[PDB]
Amino acid sequence: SMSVKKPKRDDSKDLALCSMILTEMETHEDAWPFLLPVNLKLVPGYKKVIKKPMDFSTIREKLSSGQYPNLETFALDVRLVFDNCETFNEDDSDIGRAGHNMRKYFEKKWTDTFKV
Numbered sequence: 001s002m003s004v005k006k007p008k009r010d011d012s013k014d015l016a017l018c019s020m021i022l023t024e025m026e027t028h029e030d031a032w033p034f035l036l037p038v039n040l041k042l043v044p045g046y047k048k049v050i051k052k053p054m055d056f057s058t059i060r061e062k063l064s065s066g067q068y069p070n071l072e073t074f075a076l077d078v079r080l081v082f083d084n085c086e087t088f089n090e091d092d093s094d095i096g097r098a099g100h101n102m103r104k105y106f107e108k109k110w111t112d113t114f115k116v
């Protein structure tokens with residue numbers, strides 16, 4: 001409360017750490033469905049069904065331009081990519097399985113990186 005400060009983690013390295021994680025995501029073999037935005041003009045259903053499209057290149061732009069207030073808003077956008085993928089794709093399709101793989105890959109990196 002007022003004049004009572006909770007000890008809080010050192011967040012000075014978060015930008016660098018999130019960029020590192022995003023780089024590893026971008027270079028993962030199964031990253032290909034997520035490297036660019038879904039083409040809203042060529043993919044029927046997507047624009048109407050997926051209310052908040054997100055992809056790695058958009059996250060990279062936002063990260064490079066100071067549009068993430070904190071590390072949690074970054075993680076939200078990464079998870080949005082995979083939540084969108086699950087909504088639109090069958091689990092056993094190539095894109096669907098890529099998304100599950102990439103979510104697992106992300107969440108372990110997230111855990112290993114930030115609760116030291």
Ligand SMILES: CC(=O)N(c1cc(O)ccc1C)c1cn(C(C)=O)c2ccccc12
Pocket residue numbers: 032033034035036037038039040043084085088089095
């Ligand atoms: C151009 C395009 O729309 N896609 C795409 C396809 C690729 O092979 C490589 C990269 C991308 C961005 C699609 C991504 N999709 C996802 C993530 O569900 C889709 C879901 C349905 C149809 C297309 C896509």
